[PDB]
Amino acid sequence: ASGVDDDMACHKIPVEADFLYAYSTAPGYYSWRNSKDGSWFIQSLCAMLKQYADKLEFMHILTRVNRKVATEFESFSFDATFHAKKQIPCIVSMLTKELYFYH
């Protein structure tokens, strides 16, 4: 097979390639932070990195962070409007390879 848009002589990559955005919450949603213990997302991210950085690929670590935040946390507020709310982190990957912090 052959075409006009593949196998270029000069190899290039997108300027937007190899970026990963680890968002604390889903698009359009508030993000929660405990005034004493810190944000749910960062709390969880550090815990999962500390426990799995030398064992799992980054996307899998972030998936564990997603589960931790989603299942373990729920907001508390004297204002009914902001009480009993949930949060799900959002992994946005434009990475082109697996990422391991160890080698």
Binding site: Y29, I42, L45, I88, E98, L99
Partner: protein, 146 residues
């Protein structure tokens, strides 16, 4: 040599790379934004966590929108040739696509553009990670019982 697959980023450069933490806790009264209690706990946790991953952690507290851009620009102009990756953590108030400096907003795109594959050549082909703790809107998730 034998079969080479290249399915994972080369992370054995002399340095793992930088981990820039922007920790905005106090905002100018003029903005009307409240202090972010507990953010120092996040910043410290991140410093320790990434320190153990061998990253060169650099922390900055309460930066204005101008200082945030200046910081990112300066860091992007450093020679990252011997670094395996780049990490930036943003802790502040925010909205979709925006992160707040102590005196106003900064478009996330403006921050990340400095690290584009064509603007930071020493990071081309290397993972650039942006960890963002900030709001992305005003929606609330009521959840569902499992």
């Amino acid at each position: 040599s034998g079969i080479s697959l290249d399915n994972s980023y080369k992370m054995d450069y002399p340095e793992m790379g930088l981990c820039i933490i922007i920790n905005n806790k106090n905002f100018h009264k003029s903005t009307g934004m409240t202090s972010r209690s507990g953010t120092d706990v996040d910043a410290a946790n991140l410093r320790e966590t990434f320190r153990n991953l061998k990253y060169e952690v650099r922390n900055k507290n309460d930066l204005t929108r101008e200082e945030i851009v200046e910081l990112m620009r300066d860091v992007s102009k450093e020679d990252h040739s011997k670094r395996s990756s780049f990490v930036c953590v943003l802790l502040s108030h925010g909205e979709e696509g925006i992160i707040f400096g102590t005196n106003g907003p900064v478009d996330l795109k403006k921050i990340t553009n400095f690290f584009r594959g064509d603007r930071c050549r020493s990071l081309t082909g290397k993972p650039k990670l942006f960890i963002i703790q900030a709001c992305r809107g005003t929606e609330l998730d009521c959840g569902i019982e499992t």
